[PDB]
Design a protein around this nucleic acid. Structure first.
Lengths: 68, 88, 101, 138
RNA sequence: CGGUGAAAUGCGCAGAUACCGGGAGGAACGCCGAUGGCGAAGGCAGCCACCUGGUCCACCCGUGACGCUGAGGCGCGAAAGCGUGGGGAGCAAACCGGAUUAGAUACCCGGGUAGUCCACGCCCUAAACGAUGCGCGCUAGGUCUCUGGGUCUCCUGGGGGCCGAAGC
């Protein structure tokens, strides 16, 4: 899980890309709660947060496929 | 929106005895505030049908108290409307 | 009034003289709308996840201003005029919500 | 809102026995007290003492039941099988002395409120009065 | 090329399709998103700011029964539908053609006007459904979950679910 392999970080700091990146998939998509390892309230916020970081082009909106 | 600053001012202006927070006069005066603010807000956003309910609600509540006043001591009622300016 | 975070993003290909020009504007603009700055952070150039206006990079500014409510939307309208200033975002300053701690 | 006191009471009583509790609480009030006053002296219940729950006055009505049955479902006969308000609010029913009802071939009892006070059908008649006929109970 | 069970109608040598770059515009808003949240209902999901309603918890501070319901009245009221004007990407009644079939005024395929988006005004219905009027009290628990307070491996308040005593 991503919460377990990571430390103390602000859920609201929409700039910190070095962190958020771990919350997106191999594609641009946002990890599901099963992955992130977050809570009900926690995820709700990460949603809003990335949705922001995206806009200031710090986080993608979508990626392409890799392995091959 | 209404602020602590402004609000408290409103209470002070109306209370019975300095350290009082809830009493008819107060309660009334108060809504009245909120209402008026809604009023001014509904002149615009004529399309905000929702809050307009909270408005009726507020209005009902207000009247519910006045009718009580007209019940207990009229003296207060008579005086209170003038001080607020309603069904004078 | 309320605290805010003012995200501003402008052209990455700006020279010494030009950049400080745009910055200048912003500064004067803020005061025209009453926003006193509590502090600013200049991260500067960072690579964009996606290309903004055909250009893959951007210059980054941040501004914790404490301006008047009614005029926040406007503040931006004025800010969104320069053809060099490409992204703008004004946010309410929210108490940082800790996690995994 | 609580629209009828007594009514609630009766129902707390009714509702408690059915599950088989030892005693049940209930908002106090001189009147309600006079009804419980009857029950116990009539034997439908053990008794009741005044009490305070977190600062408020309450009446602990102590329940009374029958013996443990045999066979399956040894749920004891209840001392109070039936118990219902007769005169409700918004349909009050006052009776004349002649008109006082005999309950369950006189096995149950009836409780009114006369000007000579809250009574039992038997007492009322012995007393030559009539009044608000509060309830049937047997 | 497209499309189908197959096919054809259509579009392409004025050069389509697949591919790169640029520009216009409308609609809608993936993932997060749930068996979730909110609201009186109808209904509500990109992000931001302003304006605004309701609601929950803790303290127990103030008023002192000021409460409930609610004929008629007033407002809200999906979709479609009507007026004036604007807008029109995609979808698409009617309508034009294509194939299927004993036939097809259909189900499938290609087009296509109202309409669907916006503003003002009207319409006001509905499986407008929990098919379950509103308010107060009382009657074993278990478990999952949203959310708040606490001395937080447990307690306590509010909401949404499943199983279930008594009872029905």
């Amino acid at each position: 899980k991503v919460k377990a392999t990571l430390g103390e970080f602000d859920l609201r700091d929409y700039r910190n890309v070095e962190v958020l990146k771990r919350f997106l998939s191999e594609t641009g998509k946002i990890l599901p709660r099963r992955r992130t390892g977050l809570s009900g309230k926690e995820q709700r916020i990460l949603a809003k947060t990335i949705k922001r970081a995206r806009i200031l082009g710090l986080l993608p909106f979508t990626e392409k496929l890799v392995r091959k | 929106p209404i602020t602590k600053e402004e609000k408290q001012k409103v209470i002070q202006e109306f209370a019975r005895f300095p350290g009082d927070t809830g009493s008819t006069e107060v309660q009334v005066a108060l809504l009245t505030l909120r209402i008026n603010r809604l009023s001014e807000h509904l002149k615009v956003h004529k399309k905000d049908h929702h809050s307009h309910r909270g408005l009726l609600m507020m209005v009902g509540q207000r009247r519910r108290l006045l009718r009580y006043l007209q019940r207990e001591d009229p003296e207060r009622y008579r005086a209170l409307i003038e001080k607020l300016g309603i069904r004078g | 009034m309320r605290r805010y975070e003012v995200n501003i993003v402008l052209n990455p290909n700006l020279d010494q003289s030009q950049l400080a020009l745009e910055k200048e504007i912003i500064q004067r603009a803020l005061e025209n709308y009453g926003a006193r700055v509590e502090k600013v952070e200049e991260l500067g150039l960072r690579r964009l996840a996606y290309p903004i206006a055909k250009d893959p990079q951007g210059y980054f500014l941040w501004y914790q201003v404490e301006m008047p409510e009614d005029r926040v939307n406007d503040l931006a309208r004025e800010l969104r005029i320069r053809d060099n200033v490409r992204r703008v975002m004004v946010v309410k300053s929210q108490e940082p919500f800790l996690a995994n701690a | 809102m609580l629209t009828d006191p007594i009514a609630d009471m009766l129902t707390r009583i009714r509702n408690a026995t059915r599950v088989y509790k030892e005693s049940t609480d209930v908002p106090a009030s001189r009147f309600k007290e006079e009804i419980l006053r009857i029950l116990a002296r009539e034997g439908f219940i053990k008794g009741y003492e005044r009490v305070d729950v977190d600062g408020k006055p309450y009446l602990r009505v102590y329940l009374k039941y029958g013996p443990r049955r045999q066979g399956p479902d040894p749920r004891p006969e209840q001392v109070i099988h039936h118990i219902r308000r007769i005169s409700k609010p918004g349909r009050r029913v006052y009776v004349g002395v002649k008109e006082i009802p005999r309950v369950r071939r006189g096995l149950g009892i009836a409780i009114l409120s006369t000007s000579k006070g809250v009574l039992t059908d038997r007492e009322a008649r012995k007393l030559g009065v009539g009044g608000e006929l509060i309830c049937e109970v047997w």
